[PDB]
Amino acid sequence: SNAMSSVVVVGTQWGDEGKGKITDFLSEHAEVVARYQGGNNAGHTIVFGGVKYKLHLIPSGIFYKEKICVIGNGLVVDPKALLEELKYLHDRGVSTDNLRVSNRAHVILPYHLKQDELEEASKGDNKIGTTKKGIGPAYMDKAARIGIRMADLLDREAFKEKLEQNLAQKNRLFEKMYDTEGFSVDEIFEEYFEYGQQIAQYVCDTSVVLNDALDNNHRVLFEGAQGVMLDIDHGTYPFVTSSNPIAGGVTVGTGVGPAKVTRVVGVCKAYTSRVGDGPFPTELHDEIGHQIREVGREYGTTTGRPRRVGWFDSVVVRHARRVSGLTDLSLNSIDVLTGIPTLKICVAYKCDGKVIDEVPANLNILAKCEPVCEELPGWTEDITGVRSLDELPENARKYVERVSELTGIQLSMFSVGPDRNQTNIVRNVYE
Amino acid sequence: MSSVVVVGTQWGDEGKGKITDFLSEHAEVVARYQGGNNAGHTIVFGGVKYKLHLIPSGIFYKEKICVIGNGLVVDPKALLEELKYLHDRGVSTDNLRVSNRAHVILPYHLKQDELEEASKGDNKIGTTKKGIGPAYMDKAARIGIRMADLLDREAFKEKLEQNLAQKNRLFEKMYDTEGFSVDEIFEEYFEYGQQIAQYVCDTSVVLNDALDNNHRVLFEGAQGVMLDIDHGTYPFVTSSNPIAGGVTVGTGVGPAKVTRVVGVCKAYTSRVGDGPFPTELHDEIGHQIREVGREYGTTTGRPRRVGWFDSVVVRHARRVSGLTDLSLNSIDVLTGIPTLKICVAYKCDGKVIDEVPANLNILAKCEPVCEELPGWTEDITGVRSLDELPENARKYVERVSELTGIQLSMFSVGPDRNQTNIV
Numbered sequence: 052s053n054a055m056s057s058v059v060v061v062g063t064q065w066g067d068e069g070k071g072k073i074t075d076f077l078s079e080h081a082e083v084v085a086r087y088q089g090g091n092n093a094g095h096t097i098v099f100g101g102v103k104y105k106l107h108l109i110p111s112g113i114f115y116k117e118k119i120c121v122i123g124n125g126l127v128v129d130p131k132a133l134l135e136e137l138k139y140l141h142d143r144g145v146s147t148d149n150l151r152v153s154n155r156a157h158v159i160l161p162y163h164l165k166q167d168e169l170e171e172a173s174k175g176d177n178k179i180g181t182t183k184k185g186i187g188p189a190y191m192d193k194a195a196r197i198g199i200r201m202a203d204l205l206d207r208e209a210f211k212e213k214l215e216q217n218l219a220q221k222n223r224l225f226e227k228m229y230d231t232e233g234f235s236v237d238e239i240f241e242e243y244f245e246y247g248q249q250i251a252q253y254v255c256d257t258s259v260v261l262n263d264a265l266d267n268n269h270r271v272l273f274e275g276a277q278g279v280m281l282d283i284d285h286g287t288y289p290f291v292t293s294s295n296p297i298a299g300g301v302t303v304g305t306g307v308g309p310a311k312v313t314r315v316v317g318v319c320k321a322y323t324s325r326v327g328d329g330p331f332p333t334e335l336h337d338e339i340g341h342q343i344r345e346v347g348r349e350y351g352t353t354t355g356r357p358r359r360v361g362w363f364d365s366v367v368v369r370h371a372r373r374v375s376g377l378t379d380l381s382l383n384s385i386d387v388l389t390g391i392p393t394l395k396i397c398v399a400y401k402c403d404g405k406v407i408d409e410v411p412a413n414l415n416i417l418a419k420c421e422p423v424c425e426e427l428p429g430w431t432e433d434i435t436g437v438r439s440l441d442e443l444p445e446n447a448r449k450y451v452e453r454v455s456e457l458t459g460i461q462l463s464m465f466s467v468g469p470d471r472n473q474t475n476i477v478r479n480v481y482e
Numbered sequence: 483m484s485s486v487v488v489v490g491t492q493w494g495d496e497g498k499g500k501i502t503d504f505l506s507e508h509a510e511v512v513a514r515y516q517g518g519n520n521a522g523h524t525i526v527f528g529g530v531k532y533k534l535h536l537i538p539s540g541i542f543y544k545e546k547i548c549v550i551g552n553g554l555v556v557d558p559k560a561l562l563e564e565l566k567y568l569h570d571r572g573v574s575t576d577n578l579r580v581s582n583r584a585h586v587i588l589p590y591h592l593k594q595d596e597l598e599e600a601s602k603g604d605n606k607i608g609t610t611k612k613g614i615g616p617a618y619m620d621k622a623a624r625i626g627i628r629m630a631d632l633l634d635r636e637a638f639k640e641k642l643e644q645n646l647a648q649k650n651r652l653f654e655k656m657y658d659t660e661g662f663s664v665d666e667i668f669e670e671y672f673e674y675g676q677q678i679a680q681y682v683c684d685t686s687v688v689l690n691d692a693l694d695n696n697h698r699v700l701f702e703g704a705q706g707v708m709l710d711i712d713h714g715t716y717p718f719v720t721s722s723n724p725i726a727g728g729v730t731v732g733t734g735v736g737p738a739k740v741t742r743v744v745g746v747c748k749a750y751t752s753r754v755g756d757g758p759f760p761t762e763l764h765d766e767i768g769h770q771i772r773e774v775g776r777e778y779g780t781t782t783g784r785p786r787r788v789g790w791f792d793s794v795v796v797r798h799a800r801r802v803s804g805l806t807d808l809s810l811n812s813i814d815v816l817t818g819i820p821t822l823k824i825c826v827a828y829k830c831d832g833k834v835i836d837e838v839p840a841n842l843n844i845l846a847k848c849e850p851v852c853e854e855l856p857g858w859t860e861d862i863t864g865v866r867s868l869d870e871l872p873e874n875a876r877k878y879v880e881r882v883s884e885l886t887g888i889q890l891s892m893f894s895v896g897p898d899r900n901q902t903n904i905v
């Protein structure tokens with residue numbers, strides 16, 4: 052490229068914004084694609100070359116042999132899950148020579164999965180509704196500075212020593228705090244060290260990889276997981292994930308300076324959803340909510356568990372604009388709102404009679420926020436083949452325009468269906 | 483826009499304060515973004531010395547907004563002690579803003595820090611014993627209490643009860659020791675919160691309002707790159723991100739909102755705590771550096787570890803923190819050493835590398851590969867520019883720049899404001 056070209060794709064809501072197909076789309080012209088936080092709690096389905104894939108840890112660019120795909124230091128990586136994903140790709144003829152895994156990423160082990168389950172049980176009605184993938188406990192071990200990293204996993208002596216130290220504490224935790232069974236040093240070592248040996252070929256300093264690309268004008272794309280409202284700092288704490296999905300997470304999570312990001316695409320669904328527990332001011336429980344859930348396919352891919360759905364919440368997206376420095380808006384799933392005569396967009400919260408434009412930091416106060424909404428007329432046309440704003444039925448265009456007006460973010464892309472070819476470009480985010 | 487971050491490139495003892503104090507003069511907002519009261523330096527303002535820890539260095543200018551961002555862990559007791567300290571000395575703090583999303587350090591965090599350290603035996607981290615790590619662990623666990631919670635009497639009481647039930651069982655079962663009653667903590671700390679409440683707000687709004695209105699913002703780093711939880715000498719690190727990237731997550735600003743990152747390094751290296759330190763000195767030269775550089779705990783008088791300048795570390799920092807320029811401090815400390823050394827690479831298994839290894843075992847075995855330079859004997863504490871230096875001092879400074887690949891912006895030859903000079 053002419054000059055530095057670096058784009059971050061972030062979810063502006065509580066995950067499931069449709070970031071996956073937007074990253075897939077932007078991947079087409081990127082040279083490097085990088086994850087920067089989270090673990091296998093992430094995921095999106097892609098049908099590539101007529102074959103269905105669901106990636107959880109591996110970045111979107113993997114399907115293109117010539118694009119470098121980076122798992123940054125900011126992630127928590129379950130080696131077993133990573134190898135299952137690699138095998139799935141390989142069995143379908145996808146090479147993964149282009150994968151790069153940070154030597155400083157943290158490693159999720161079986162005790163993290165059990166700790167996740169036990170912590171959730173202990174919280175009773177205050178449970179977070181985590182993905183049960185050990186994410187929280189791995190990030191806790193990182194902060195505790197007892198966590199095991201990829202560099203350690205590759206070292207026969209170091210991995211054994213850290214397991215011995217860690218299991219000494221964790222087994223006492225399980226046995227004495229939770230009255231349950233723990234794990235075995237030797238069994239975890241033998242199984243997971245072998246996983247490490249299969250991953251070793253990809254392990255390197257990924258900050259060097261990304262900065263070499265950035266400094267030499269290669270197009271770099273950063274792929275966010277979860278979304279701003281699940282951010283450990285800026286989301287609906289404690290009903291959040293234990294990492295930073297905001298664009299800022301790219302800097303700490305890959306080792307790049309903050310000025311090395313040129314554009315931040317905030318991906319918003321035309322309505323909102325939550326998978327786990329916690330406040331959700333615009334949540335719906337009516338026939339419209341059911342229609343949105345059904346048409347939007349808002350169910351767990353694996354479990355079929357219904358997600359919570361609600362009207363678009365512009366308070367949340369204006370919050371995301373600020374804390375994540377959003378420069379560009381991608382509005383997805385507009386087709387899901389087809390056939391609903393009156394649509395609503397939440398423009399403010401009412402909190403004990405007081406109308407506010409902020410997400411309160413105090414959960415008890417946020418839990419009291421009632422949505423204050425504008426109503427907009429809907430449309431009946433099938434818009435799943437539409438190619439431009441001009442082509443949209445008047446009311447659908449007005450709805451799209453109103454989202455950009457209310458959020459203060461210029462529209463750069465919109466999507467009218469779940470497929471990659473249903474993404475329409477309004478503005479180029481690469482220069 | 484003007485939005486500058488001052489970051490330490492070593493292990494937190496780089497003389498960041500000299501640079502922050504100078505740059506604060508023309509900033510309109512000064513913001514901390516990570517860490518807690520495990521920070522601070524002596525500020526000279528109007529000729530008067532002040533020592534702070536949590537409060538940003540711009541507090542003395544009534545017209546400058548000072549922000550404690552969401553990324554910090556805040557001991558309310560310690561914060562109030564600092565507030566009273568300033569008020570007793572005639573300094574107003576109306577300009578302080580405290581994030582409603584910053585996490586709160588409570589007495590059980592301090593005990594937990596001590597217990598964890600004991601449990602690690604010879605592998606202890608050598609923490610500052612201020613409860614920093616345990617507070618960041620509770621954050622990741624999502625059980626941590628934030629400033630907004632502290633201000634809510636019933637919610638604070640409920641979270642204290644929940645957390646103490648867990649922590650007390652933790653201390654009993656894991657550490658064979660007693661914990662705390664709710665009574666021991668509740669009223670005392672709730673009252674601290676009530677005295678801080680006047681400052682509590684959305685600090686992301688404060689910072690973005692300033693940025694979007696072309697006000698100059700200065701972000702004040704604590705610790706240094708080699709103590710970074712991700713990029714430092716893990717696990718011998720602090721539990722936050724001192725790198726420039728930490729400002730984004732730690733204050734809620736987008737990455738492209740930072741325009742300049744000033745890396746600060748000393749002309750030699752130092753560590754306060756435990757862990758690898760490839761260029762560490764255990765000889766007469768080491769003592770001279772510690773003595774002249776006054777490298778001792780400000781409160782305990784505990785000596786710090788010192789060593790030669792390490793350019794591998796600073797090149798690492800250049801990359802992971804996106805350094806735009808470099809300030810080189812305490813050059814005067816190297817006076818009177820006949821042969822100076824700068825580490826340009828590491829030797830491990832006789833293999834020469836230009837990287838900081840992620841693997842602790844490899845790092846612990848890295849031997850420094852050094853270039854040797856002739857020293858000087860003259861007093862350089864009075865110079866205002868590089869061309870006033872003795873030849874060998876100027877050459878030393880030039881080589882640091884050449885080896886790190888970073889342009890020099892400032893240098894210092896003393897503790898005073900007039901001993902920090904532009905390049």
Ligand SMILES: Nc1ncnc2c1ncn2[C@@H]1O[C@H](COP(=O)(O)O)[C@@H](O)[C@H]1O
Nearest residue numbers: 066092093180181182186291292326327
């Ligand atoms: N890929 C995802 N999509 C939507 N929500 C998620 C995702 N990953 C985590 N979460 C949510 O983040 C919170 C914490 O889960 P975990 O990240 O497993 O600790 C819960 O509310 C989850 O439902």
Ligand SMILES: Nc1ncnc2c1ncn2[C@@H]1O[C@H](COP(=O)(O)O)[C@@H](O)[C@H]1O
Nearest residue numbers: 494520521608609610614719720754755
């Ligand atoms: N202000 C500081 N200056 C130098 N080293 C520090 C500072 N704060 C923390 N550290 C180091 O960071 C590590 C973790 O300490 P803590 O931040 O208390 O968890 C130890 O090596 C400390 O010596």
